[PDB]
Design a protein around this ligand. Structure first.
Ligand code: ADP
Length: 286
C-alpha cells in the first residue's frame, strides 16, 4: 500500500491490524515523560542512521535488533512508537503471547511486509515468553530475522533473565528501562490529570513523593482510580435506575479531590517488585 503488494491469505487481516504507517502514528518523542538516556540511545540507533547514512556505515553500521528490558508499564511500547514517528518508520506492534494464540504465516508476512515499507520498526513485546508446537514462531522469528538483516527490530521483556541464550544472541544491545523518579512522576500525574475536573487543593508534589515504586502505568492507574472514586464517594441509591436523574446530573460537576487520591493511594500499589528492577539492571551488564 505504498506501491504494489498483494498476497492471497486471510492473514493480511492481522498483519495490517498491527501495522502503522509513518502517517498513522503522529506520535512525538516529546510525548514521553523522562527516559532521556533511552531516547538518546534509540535516537542515535534508529533516527540518525536514517538521516545521515553516509556516516552510519562500515565501522558505524547501525544495530538491526535491540531489546528493551525493564519493569512493566515503564513505557517500552511508547518509546517504540515514538522513535518510529521521529524516524519516519513504519511501525509493527506484535506481542509474543498474541502470536501463540493466533501464526507462522504472520511472521513471514510481518517481516516481508516490514521490508516492503522502506525503513520500518518491528516491535516485539514480552519476547521472554517465547524463550505444544509453537516452535512454528518461537524459531520462525529467528529465521525471518537472521535473513531480514532498513528493518529494525525492537523487543521488550519484563523478565530479561528468562531470556534463553538463543535469543540473547540475536539481541546484543540491551537497554535498561527504569522507573520514573520523583520528578518524572509529578509530570506524569499532571499529564494524566490534564483535562479532568479537579480541585486546585491537590498538590502534585505529595503525590509524586507518595508513589515511590510506581511505574508510568501505575501512575495513570492511580489517576483513573481517584477519578472514579468520585463515583464511589456518591450515595449509591440516588444513582439507580435506567432513566436519567438529577443525581447523575450532579455527578458531572464533581471534582477529583485529595480524598480521591487518598482512597486510590490505598488501593493501587506498585507492580514493580523491589528485587525485580535490579533483575534487569544487572542483566543488562552480564
Ligand atoms: N514515561 C512515560 N511517559 C508518558 N506515559 C507513560 C510513560 N510510561 C508509561 N506511560 C503510560 O503507561 C501506559 C503503558 O505504557 P507501555 O508503553 O505499555 O509500557 P510497557 O511497554 O512497559 O508496557 C501508556 O499508555 C502510557 O500512557
Amino acid at each position: 500500500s505504498f506501491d504494489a503488494s498483494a498476497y492471497d491469505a486471510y492473514i493480511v487481516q492481522a498483519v495490517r491490524g498491527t501495522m502503522a504507517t509513518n502517517t498513522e502514528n503522529t506520535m512525538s518523542l516529546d510525548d514521553i515523560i523522562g527516559m532521556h538516556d533511552v531516547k538518546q540511545v534509540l535516537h542515535e540507533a534508529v533516527t540518525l542512521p536514517l538521516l545521515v547514512p553516509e556516516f552510519f556505515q562500515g565501522l558505524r553500521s547501525p544495530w538491526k535488533a535491540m531489546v528493551l528490558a525493564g519493569p512493566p508499564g515503564t513505557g517500552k511500547t511508547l518509546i517504540a512508537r515514538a522513535i518510529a514517528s521521529e524516524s519516519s518508520s513504519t511501525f509493527f506492534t506484535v506481542s509474543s503471547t498474541d502470536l501463540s494464540s493466533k501464526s507462522e504465516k504472520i511472521v513471514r508476512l510481518l517481516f516481508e511486509l516490514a521490508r516492503f515499507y522502506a525503513p520500518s520498526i518491528i516491535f516485539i513485546d514480552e519476547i521472554d515468553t517465547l524463550g505444544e508446537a509453537s516452535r512454528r514462531v518461537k524459531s520462525e522469528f529467528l529465521v525471518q530475522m537472521d535473513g531480514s538483516q532498513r528493518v529494525f527490530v525492537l523487543a521488550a521483556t519484563n523478565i530479561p533473565w528468562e531470556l534463553d541464550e538463543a535469543l540473547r544472541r540475536r539481541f546484543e544491545k540491551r537497554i535498561f528501562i527504569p522507573l520514573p523518579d520523583i520528578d518524572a512522576r509529578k509530570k506524569l500525574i499532571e499529564k494524566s490529570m490534564e483535562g479532568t475536573p479537579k480541585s486546585d487543593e491537590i498538590n502534585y508534589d505529595d503525590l509524586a513523593a507518595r508513589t515511590e515504586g510506581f511505574s508510568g502505568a501505575d501512575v495513570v492507574s492511580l489517576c483513573r482510580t481517584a477519578a472514579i472514586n468520585v463515583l464511589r464517594r456518591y450515595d449509591t441509591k440516588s444513582l439507580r435506575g435506567g432513566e436519567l436523574t438529577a443525581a447523575m446530573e450532579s455527578l458531572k460537576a464533581e471534582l477529583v479531590r485529595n480524598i480521591d487520591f487518598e482512597a486510590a493511594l490505598q488501593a493501587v500499589s506498585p507492580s514493580a517488585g523491589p528485587d525485580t528492577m535490579l533483575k534487569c539492571k544487572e542483566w543488562c551488564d552480564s
